[PDB]
Each structure stands twice: as structure tokens, then as C-alpha cells.
Structure 1
Amino acid sequence: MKQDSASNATYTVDCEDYVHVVEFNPFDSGEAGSLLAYGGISYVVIASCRFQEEDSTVEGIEFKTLKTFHHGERVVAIAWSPETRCDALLPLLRFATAAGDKKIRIFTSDFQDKNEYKVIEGHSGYINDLVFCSPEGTDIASVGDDHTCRIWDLDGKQIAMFILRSPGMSVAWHPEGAFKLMVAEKTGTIRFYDLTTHQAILSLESVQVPLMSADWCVRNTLRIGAVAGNDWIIWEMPRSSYPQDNKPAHADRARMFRWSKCNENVFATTGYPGKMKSQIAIHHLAHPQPILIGTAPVGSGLSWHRRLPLCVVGGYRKLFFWLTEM
């Protein structure tokens, strides 16, 4: 008989609420303490997280809830503005949220003075994903089960339309910002739209149904990884129109593909927690087998640390941290 690899989370944070979604910052906001946002039916919490590296004043993990908002809805998706900033006396935090009401809320916070949200017209169905398609956070690109890519201003006015022949699941702003908008569709296709001319500049073609998630390399925008069917795939644009790397992602239904925001070769594909506890597998480039695999009783939402290789998954009353080091 044989067993492959599994382990308990490197860190674990207790919770009095379930974690539907939990995410760090894609770009640094100017804070040593890593900002972390997690949402649920009852509460949505922004906090600063620290794990011990220096000083004996910090033991294990220190989690300081910066603020907690009373909620009454299951959070569907959250996207911060790619303009990341927390260095001021009253740092300004800007992001977009989707709820079960098929609506878009532009939530903004001014650090212990006010918290606001705007009502933005949503999709005929649920909005699958959404990003801020502007490098400062004024325009929002949203894609949902209605095969419409909708670009909205801060007012809630629909700036632009891109029609799809299949429900658009994934939308991605250029992390640096060049009017480039990545579109990932369930069949497995990738389409790059130029927001200035409202047309596709490039496309990656695949037919492996279904596509579940995708991720640029934060350190290599030209490198794209994804999860489709059961396997993680990789393109290196613009020299690809069909997948060039294709290796299994999980024994489980791979749900999200994410890139570690410290390196150019570290990524994660998450397994689906169906009958069996969710598998979490950190791979490496030029090494088909994942370097690390852990087990989580419930797996929903996976993220990577802003500047370091840590992958996070939130579940029932628990928040599991995997510190991937070399």
C-alpha cells in the first residue's frame, strides 16, 4: 500500500463564524502587517495578520481585527482596487463585493471614521467574478452567468459591454494596468480585451471543459496558469494558442488556481471538498508533482500572501495557513 503526502495546517486561526471567502492583498498597500479580509453571512472582517519571524513579543500568530462589519448576506466575490494603499493617518480602502442579490457593492472605508457602499446594477444571474479594470479603482469589470462582460464606473453606470457566447466566469485586470482585460471562459478559452478599443488583441484557445479558475504569474504576466477539468495548465504568451503545460492538479475537482505572490515558479491548485477533506497542493514549475500537499476538513477560497509564499484557506470556524518555504 501507499500514501502520497498530507499534513496539518502550518497555522490555524479560530473563528466564531464560517469563512466563505478570505483573501490577502494582491499588491502591497504599505503595511508590514498583512491585511486580510474574510466574509460570511453574519460578519465581514478586515484585519492585520502577523506570524512570528522576529521578537519574542510575537508568539506564534498575532491576528488584530482592524474592523468588523455586521453582515446579513453570503459574500460571493470581493476584489480590491489594484491601487493598494494603507500608509496614511486614515487609509482609504476601496473594493467591490458581490452578494446573493445579484448586485454589485462598491465598499469604501476611511479607517475608523466611515464605511460606505454604493448600489451598482448587477447581472441577470449571479456574477461569477469581478475585478477593478483600472489601475486606480474607478472602473469595475464584472462577468457572470449571463455571458456579459459589464464595465461600470464608480457611479454604477454601465460604461461598456462585451458580449459572450457562453457565461463569462472569470475577468482579470492587468495587474500593472495596460487596458488589458483577461477573460477566462468555461470551455477553456482566454480572450484579451483592450479597454480603449473594445476589441480582442489576443486569445488562447482550448477545449478542455470545464475551466474552473486561472491566474497570471504576478512576477510574469506573460505566464498564465489555470485549472481545467482536473488538471493545471500553463501558457506562456504570446507564443501559445493551445496549452503548452498540462499536468494533473488534484485527485479532487480542482476549483481555484492561484499564484504565490513572492515567486515566479510557485502556485497552488485547490481540491474540491466533496465527500473527502479538501486537498491543497502546492506545485512548482518543471516539477509535475506538487511540492506540498495538506488536508483541510473544509476548503472554500484560497489565497496567497501579498509578498510571501503563504497559502490560506478558510472553512468552518477555522482559517488554515500553509507556510511554503524553501
Structure 2
Amino acid sequence: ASNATYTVDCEDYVHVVEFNPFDSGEAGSLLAYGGISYVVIASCRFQEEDSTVEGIEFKTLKTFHHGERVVAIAWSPETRCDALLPLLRFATAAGDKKIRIFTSDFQDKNEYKVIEGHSGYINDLVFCSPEGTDIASVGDDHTCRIWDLDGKQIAMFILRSPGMSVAWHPEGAFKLMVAEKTGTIRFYDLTTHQAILSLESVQVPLMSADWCVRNTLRIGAVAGNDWIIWEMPRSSYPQDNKPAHADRARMFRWSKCNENVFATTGYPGKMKSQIAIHHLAHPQPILIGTAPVGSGLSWHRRLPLCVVGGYRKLFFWLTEM
């Protein structure tokens, strides 16, 4: 088990962690993490980006009182730290089945809006517009729902099982990916409000799916114990299927810098949650990390670096390319 390259202390348990995938106009990479009753927004700078930094410079920028356990965080594309018009916008899902949109100027103006209408737990959410006006959410009510920033439901797709992950297509307009617990991944067009296509996993339950940003034909997921890769439009069947974890895989995320590298996490388990970093050319994980109990997995935008939340700590692994 590799030790984490960097470790940052947190006030409480980290339930979710997400790097800002967008350019905020700052030299540092923005990071959001959700606790039991709060969301923290921080800036991270690494020695690999700036030779004036020894290891990791971690600065808390803002803390938002949430009052509920945060389960998912989505960054808005409008998020900017530019000194002329700073705007922080992100969405959260929590155990109360509500979405909260937070807006801040990083000064005194801190607003949040509550969106209601899911009848079950929300499992995942994303901003599903380049303009950052629309939010997609999925949950245990067997719905995928589309919301404006006004909290009005624009659209609703009835699922055949609980929606487990949702992702916007990185290049193609109007394409939403929805991963269902029974192994089906569906693609929806938000203009026509129609399902375009599905993929099926060989294993169940399907727990997380992500798009490869560097190769928009590739989808990766975790189902049962295994990680699964599809290459579109070649087949509805997996191209690759290999073991990820000895007992239940939970999260899958593609590296933002390398189309052959991805991370998986094991389920919040008695054997301390393993992070496994995989490279498609290798039959085994290139790195196996241990986090004592960790939830959330996110990749840095530029560096070959991933973060996992744990017990009062963030753990960072740099992958040698």
C-alpha cells in the first residue's frame, strides 16, 4: 500500500470531494469537500505546478453551513476567482433529498437556493449546460431530473432502477449520461428529451460511471467488484472488464490528463477503503493506496493527481506518468 503523496487535515469527516474541473482564472486549483454539516471551498497549489511551493499549499477560501450530510457536489462552469467579478457557484445534494445551489462573491454575498421534488435520496448531480444554467440529478426515486437555477423542473426521465451516476458529455451538446443501478447506462438528448442509446454492464450493481474527457468515445464504470470500459460507437458490450476491488467497487473517475488512467474506490469497508489507480496497458493497478474510511474521488484538472476524502483528512496520490 503506497502512502498518500500529500495529506491535508480537515475539521470533520470528508463525505465527498470534487476538484473544480473548470478554469477559475487563479494559479491554484479549486477544491470543494462536503462534511457532516458543511461544505468547504479551498485552493490547492502543488510543488509540481510551482517550484516555490514545498509539497502542498492548502488554503480554505470559504466554509458554507449546510446543516445536512453532503452526498454529491457539482461545480458550475461560471465559477471564477478573477478579481474584477469573482463568482463561486456550485450545487450540492444531501441526505434530506434536496439540491442546494450556493452562490458567492468570495466576500459578504453568500446566497443559497433549495430545490425540492425528488421523493428518494439523490445519488449524483451535475451541471448539464455549457452556460451553467441547468442541473441534472439522479436518485432512488428512479428519476433523472433537470432543473434551472430557479429550481423549476425543466425535464424528467423515468428510470427502470435507481439512478447511481450522472455526467454531462464533455464536447457534444445536449447529451446526458445516466447510469442505473441494474447495469444500464442511458444517454439522453436534452433538446429532444429522448433516450438515444444504452450500454449494459455484465456485472451489477453499477455504482459509478464517468466520461473520458480526453477521448469522448470512452466510458468507464464500476459494477459489482469490477471496472468496465466501453468504446463507442463500436459496441454496446464492454471492451474491457477486470477486477477493481476484492469487495464491491464504489466510485470510478477518469484522469483529466491521461485517457488510459483512472481511479476506483472500494465500498466504506472493514478492510480500510482501498483506492486503486489503473492504467489500461497494465493488468494490475499501478498504485494501491489505503484510506481508513473515505468517500468522494476526484482528479486534478492538469496534474496526474487524484484526491480522496477520509476521516478528518484529504489524501492525495500523484501518479508517475
Q: TM-score, normalised by structure 2?
A: 0.95
Q: Which moved more, 1:50-59 or 1:37-46?
A: 50-59
- C-alpha displacement of 1:124: 0.5
**1:184 aligned onto 2:182:** no
- Label 1:54 to 1:212 Cα distance change in 2 as closer, same or farther (>3 A): closer
The 2-side partners of 1:241 and 1:57 are apart by: 48
Q: Which moved more, 1:287-296 or 1:232-241?
A: 287-296
Preserved CA contact (<8 Å) 2:17 2:73: no
- The percent of aligned pairs where both chains have the same amino acid is 100
Q: Which moved more, 1:162-171 or 1:259-268?
A: 162-171
Cα deviations by residue, 1:182-204 (Å, 9 ceiling, x for unpaired) = 01111111111111111112221
The 2-side partners of 1:54 and 1:75 are apart by: 30
The 1-side partners of 2:50 and 2:104 are apart by: 31
- C-alpha displacement of 1:284: 0.5
- Label 1:312 to 1:194 Cα distance change in 2 as closer, same or farther (>3 A): same
Aligned partner of 1:256 in structure 2 is 251
The 1-side partners of 2:117 and 2:167 are apart by: 18
Preserved CA contact (<8 Å) 1:104 1:122: no
After superposition, residues 112-131 of structure 1 pair within 5 angstroms as 112-131=107-126
After superposition, residues 283-322 of structure 1 pair within 5 angstroms as 283-322=278-317
- C-alpha displacement of 1:310: 0.7
- C-alpha displacement of 1:234: 0.4
Please list every run of 5 or more consecutive structure 1 residues that lacks an aligned counterpart in the other structure.
1-5
The 2-side partners of 1:117 and 1:243 are apart by: 41
Aligned partner of 1:135 in structure 2 is 130
The 2-side partners of 1:27 and 1:304 are apart by: 12
**1:7 aligned onto 2:2:** yes
- C-alpha displacement of 1:235: 0.4
- C-alpha displacement of 1:84: 4.6
The 2-side partners of 1:84 and 1:67 are apart by: 14
- C-alpha displacement of 1:64: 1.1
- Label 1:84 to 1:218 Cα distance change in 2 as closer, same or farther (>3 A): farther
Aligned partner of 1:155 in structure 2 is 150
The 2-side partners of 1:172 and 1:122 are apart by: 20
Cα deviations by residue, 1:100-149 (Å, 9 ceiling, x for unpaired) = 22111111111213111112113101111111111111111111101111
- C-alpha displacement of 1:18: 1.6
Preserved CA contact (<8 Å) 1:252 1:279: no
Cα deviations by residue, 1:234-273 (Å, 9 ceiling, x for unpaired) = 0001111111110111123211000111111110111224
- Label 1:158 to 1:295 Cα distance change in 2 as closer, same or farther (>3 A): same
How many residues are matched? 321
Preserved CA contact (<8 Å) 2:166 2:209: no
Q: TM-score, normalised by structure 1?
A: 0.93
- C-alpha displacement of 1:225: 0.7
The 1-side partners of 2:113 and 2:212 are apart by: 31
Aligned CA-pair RMSD: 1.7
- Label 1:28 to 1:56 Cα distance change in 2 as closer, same or farther (>3 A): closer
The 2-side partners of 1:208 and 1:7 are apart by: 29
- Label 1:88 to 1:55 Cα distance change in 2 as closer, same or farther (>3 A): closer
Q: Which moved more, 1:168-177 or 1:155-164?
A: 168-177
- C-alpha displacement of 1:207: 4.6
- C-alpha displacement of 1:43: 2.9
Find the residue that maps to 1:162 and give its secondary structure: strand
Find the residue that maps to 1:202 and give its secondary structure: strand
- C-alpha displacement of 1:58: 2.5
- Label 1:116 to 1:250 Cα distance change in 2 as closer, same or farther (>3 A): same
The 2-side partners of 1:235 and 1:303 are apart by: 21
Preserved CA contact (<8 Å) 1:77 1:99: yes
Preserved CA contact (<8 Å) 1:103 1:120: yes
The 1-side partners of 2:298 and 2:319 are apart by: 13
The 2-side partners of 1:325 and 1:208 are apart by: 31
Aligned partner of 2:194 in structure 1 is 199
The 1-side partners of 2:19 and 2:174 are apart by: 24
Preserved CA contact (<8 Å) 2:18 2:31: yes
